């Protein structure tokens, strides 16, 4: 039965916001089992509150927040949760006073800045959020979540060149996960330029050697190579090696979809052959 | 210029399964739109996956004599309805091969019992005016809590064993 606890913990660990199941299991486990659980419920309240905000209810929010208040009176985290409550109901300046206060009584506190920025972004404004986030990063380096958010924001502003610099800062450290290299390759391939596609195939490869079961990296390599084999600016040797790259990748994709098939094979073979 | 019940169904379903992220999908006709596809959610300013999805859906729709003729986006923020560059590019590319395809953006500020159709017609995807049982179907199936088995293309890239056509929903709405 305790499985519910471990599933909640899982969703806490690998952030998996869906805020439909969470609130259910929370309200189930917010009951008498609380006294059974023992000194562990508080995190479950901090986790159910946010998912509830995500579901629209807002009724369970104050119950969880007031439990938190009564246990931890002079806290800071519950203050952040009150700021969240405010900004959901669209009291922005109040929340700003709050965050500036608990930064004023604690300058080396990050969460207040990272909520001020969420507010600045929820208004619609981006360009000032970016410089605020950089002025933050100008002090609190080693904030990987921030680097990834910055990369996403530069992407949605259609500046694909500095997002790559952030991804460099972010896959230099923790260089054992495919996702970062893959997203770097997608950035570059989108950026255009042969000098970049030569990197796109490289990193779509390295991101495959690691996992060796990813699929997006595979199609990425296939498309990068196939497009190299038509750009009339490279010596023959380039094109002849990219042809074999693409053909081998095609064979491997054939293997994969064959495993899958136990009608798709038709369409994928068409895609293969048409070039 | 007709709205198919199942199209709107899959459309708003995808909009609801990932309700805090911007999504796009894709309508396929043989103007009557005949089937929706949920393909992506996330950032969406990135070519390769999009390019291969378009290619594969072409290779597959030829078999059944269908052409795409239709796009739709739904931003993450509710209070926004504006055809960001990306969708404009994708619809100008689709109308290079159809020259009658229409763009859709769901208002999403009502999201209960919405459409904002544009049209190029030599203009930069300008607006038009509103042109039921499918509404009831939508409401019922939504409250049926069934969106959790609706597969998009982004899921297909992880677990190949899915089926982006998801005929289960098709037959399901057929029974209604």
């Amino acid at each position: 039965w305790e499985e519910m606890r471990d599933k909640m913990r899982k969703w806490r660990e690998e952030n998996s916001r869906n805020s439909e199941q969470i609130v259910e299991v929370g309200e189930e486990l917010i009951n008498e089992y609380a006294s059974k659980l023992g000194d562990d419920i508080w995190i479950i309240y901090e986790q159910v509150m946010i998912a509830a905000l995500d579901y629209g209810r807002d009724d369970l929010a104050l119950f969880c927040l007031q439990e938190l208040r009564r246990q931890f009176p002079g806290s800071h985290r519950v203050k952040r949760l009150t700021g969240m409550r405010f900004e959901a109901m669209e009291r922005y300046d109040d929340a700003i006073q709050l965050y500036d206060r608990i930064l004023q009584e604690d300058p080396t506190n990050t969460a207040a800045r990272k909520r001020k920025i969420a507010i600045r972004k929820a208004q619609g404004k981006n360009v000032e959020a970016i410089r605020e986030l950089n002025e933050y990063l100008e002090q609190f380096v080693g904030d990987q979540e921030a680097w990834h958010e910055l990369a996403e924001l530069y992407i949605n502003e259609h500046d694909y060149a500095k997002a790559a610099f952030c991804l460099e800062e972010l896959m230099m450290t923790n260089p054992h996960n495919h996702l970062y290299c893959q997203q770097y390759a997608e950035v570059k391939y989108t950026q255009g330029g042969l000098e970049n596609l030569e990197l796109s195939r490289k990193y779509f490869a390295q991101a495959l050697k690691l996992n060796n079961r990813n699929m997006r990296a595979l199609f990425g390599l296939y498309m990068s190579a196939s497009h190299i084999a038509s750009n009339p600016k490279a010596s023959a040797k380039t094109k002849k090696d990219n042809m074999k790259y693409a053909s081998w990748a095609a064979s491997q994709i054939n293997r994969a979809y064959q495993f899958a098939g136990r009608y798709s094979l038709k369409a994928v073979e068409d895609m293969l052959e048409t070039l | 210029v007709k709205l198919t019940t199942q199209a709107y169904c899959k459309m708003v379903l995808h909009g609801a399964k990932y309700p805090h992220c911007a999504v796009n999908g894709l309508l396929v006709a043989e103007t009557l739109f005949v089937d929706c596809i949920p393909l992506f959610h996330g950032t969406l300013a990135l070519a390769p996956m999009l390019e291969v999805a378009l290619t594969l859906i072409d290779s597959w729709c030829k078999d059944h004599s269908y052409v795409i003729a239709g796009y739709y986006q739904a931003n993450e923020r509710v209070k926004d309805a504006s055809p960001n560059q990306v969708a404009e590019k994708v619809a100008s590319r689709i109308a290079e091969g159809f020259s009658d395809t229409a763009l859709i953006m769901v208002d999403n500020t009502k999201f209960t019992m919405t459409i904002h159709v544009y049209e190029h017609h030599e203009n930069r995807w300008r607006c038009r005016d509103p042109h039921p049982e499918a509404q009831r179907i939508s409401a019922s199936l939504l409250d049926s809590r069934s969106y959790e088995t609706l597969v998009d293309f982004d899921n297909h890239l992880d677990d190949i064993r899915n089926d982006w056509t998801n005929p289960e929903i098709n037959k399901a709405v057929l029974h209604l």
């Binding site: 410089r131 950089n134 259609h158 694909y160 255009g192 196939s226 070039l275 | 390019e51 290619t55 590019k89």
Partner: peptide, 20 residues
């Protein structure tokens, strides 16, 4: 012939100068 070819188009420690 690739039918669907798309073209879409201060951070501390970033310069563009092709430094050797």
């Amino acid at each position: 012939r690739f039918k669907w070819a798309i073209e879409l188009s201060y951070p501390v420690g970033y310069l563009d100068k092709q430094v050797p």
